[PDB]
Ligand binder design. Structure first.
Ligand SMILES: NC(=O)C1=CN([C@@H]2O[C@H](COP(=O)(O)OP(=O)(O)OC[C@H]3O[C@@H](n4cnc5c(N)ncnc54)[C@H](O)[C@@H]3O)[C@@H](O)[C@H]2O)C=CC1
Length: 405
């Protein structure tokens, strides 16, 4: 009885994290993103040998799909995910990557992945080995890591990022998605070590080490390109993302990209850019109470303007318009911008006006909290069209050409 080895997978939410994922729904999600790309059409003169660091979920997964199925690229992915086993579904990023390999093979595209700590030297060396063996060199490096912690590869110190303002304490409105209440909480300012720790985790050092180690090993093509993804947002979240501990990390990136750009533009006119993207629902969104509230408001306002979109729409445009096309959105620091429709003055004015009217009683009249909840479950493979959630599945979905570090 393989009924012993298969199970019916449902969402289990503990705190504000979904601790299960559905493999069939994750596959359908990857397919939906692939189908969006192929419907929009090919992207000309894109890279053909692409390394994506953080390739299993969210924006990194969208970049891998865009590169592969939009630009026709062979892709090498790096991520840190949990395989499935009997009675214990793996992470959504694992099932997403299983689906990616499946569809890439169907279309005759190279797909290899490395599972391990991208902050470590050992994973960087395994990645170099794969490029040498399979691709020779890569002509694009996407940096799309998001982690709350980083083990420094030389010293072994474990750094933890902090989500805090700098200077004064601040009162931040948020939405508790477990109790479904509007709630304010006071965040204390970050200590200097909380700033230093957040810069170490979320700044540009590891990104630079990736370029540094790859160069020393000679696996970056001429005219090579690299970009790191980030969020800047506007006033509502600025206490954190502009002036806060995370802001300090983003000030690291605007400097590191200049050094990286200098190294590549001497290498046959390569280029490097910080790419700024719009706010989306991500796995960790519900645990930062301000984001569910902001997203629920932003979604409703942008839907009323016809401009709501998620990861694959964002990154397809970034590739088509900025990384590979001739209508880039450069800003004054030299950042590629894909977030301009979120930062529409009228959108922001409307969100900021609704921000100060939303209460426990009008949440569903003033916001798209419904949409937030649906898109959050979607991340883990739940609520997808055409999926029979009553059918048993084997949680141990395997991945060919998966290098375990
Ligand atoms: N979620 C959002 O609203 C926005 C996010 N971004 C940027 O997008 C990038 C990706 O983050 P998200 O898509 O937000 O969510 P995400 O959590 O979906 O992606 C995180 C990725 O990093 C990988 N990862 C984490 N720790 C790792 C480790 N130690 N070793 C190897 N891989 C590891 C995960 O496997 C996954 O592939 C980040 O650079 C973030 O700043 C930019 C704009 C908005």
């Amino acid at each position: 009885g393989s009924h012993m080895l298969e199970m019916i997978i449902k969402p289990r939410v503990r705190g504000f994290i979904c601790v299960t994922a559905h493999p069939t729904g994750c596959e359908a999600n990857v397919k939906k993103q692939i189908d969006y790309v192929t419907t929009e059409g090919p992207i000309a003169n894109g890279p053909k040998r692409v390394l994506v660091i953080g390739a299993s979920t969210g924006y990194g997964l969208a970049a891998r799909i865009t590169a592969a199925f939009g630009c026709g690229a062979d892709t090498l992915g790096v991520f840190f995910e949990r395989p499935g086993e009997e009675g214990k579904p793996g992470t959504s990023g694992w099932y997403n990557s299983a689906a990616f390999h499946k569809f890439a093979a169907q279309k005759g595209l190279y797909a290899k992945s490395i599972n391990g700590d991208a902050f470590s030297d050992e994973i960087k060396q395994l990645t170099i080995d794969a490029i040498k063996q399979d691709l020779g060199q890569v002509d694009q490096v996407i940096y799309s890591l998001a982690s709350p912690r980083r083990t420094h590869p030389k010293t072994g110190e474990v750094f933890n990022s902090a989500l805090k303002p700098i200077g004064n304490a601040v009162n931040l409105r948020g939405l508790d998605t477990d109790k479904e209440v509007i709630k304010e909480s006071v965040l204390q300012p970050a200590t200097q070590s909380e700033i230093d720790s957040t810069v170490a985790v979320m700044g540009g050092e590891d990104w630079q080490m990736w370029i540094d180690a790859l160069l020393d090993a000679g696996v970056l093509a001429e005219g090579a390109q690299t970009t790191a993804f980030t969020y800047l947002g506007e006033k509502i979240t600025h206490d954190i993302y502009w002036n806060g501990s995370i802001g300090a990390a983003k000030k690291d990136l605007d400097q590191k990209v200049l050094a990286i750009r200098e190294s590549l533009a001497a290498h046959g006119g390569g280029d490097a850019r910080v790419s700024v993207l719009k706010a989306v629902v991500a796995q960790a969104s519900s645990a930062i109470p301000m984001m569910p509230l902001y997203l629920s408001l932003l979604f409703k306002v942008m839907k009323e303007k016809g401009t709501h979109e998620g990861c694959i729409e964002q990154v397809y445009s970034l590739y088509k318009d900025s990384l590979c096309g001739d209508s880039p959105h450069m800003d004054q620091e030299g950042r590629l911008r894909a977030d301009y429709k979120e930062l529409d003055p009228e959108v922001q004015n409307q969100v900021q006006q609704l921000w100060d009217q939303v209460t426990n009683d009008n949440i569903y009249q003033l916001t798209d909290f419904v949409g937030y909840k649906s898109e959050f479950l979607n991340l883990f493979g739940f609520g997808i069209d055409g999926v029979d959630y009553d059918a048993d599945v084997n949680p141990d979905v395997k991945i060919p050409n998966l290098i375990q570090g």
